[PDB]
Amino acid sequence: KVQIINKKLDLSNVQSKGSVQIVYKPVDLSKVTSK
């Protein structure tokens, strides 16, 4: 009945009174089947 894929990429700074966060070549596959 119900088939769900959820993919989230979170990127956040909280700078209060530089900053580097890199994602370098991500590859994502999601395989969900039924028989």
Residues 2-31 close enough to bind a copy of itself by CB under 8 A: 2-31
CB of 15 to a copy of itself, least distance (A): 5
- Give the integer Cα–Cα distance in Å for 8 and 13: 17
CB of 35 to a copy of itself, least distance (A): 5
CB of 19 to a copy of itself, least distance (A): 5
- Give the integer Cα–Cα distance in Å for 32 and 3: 8
Residues that bind a copy of itself (CB under 8 A): 1-35
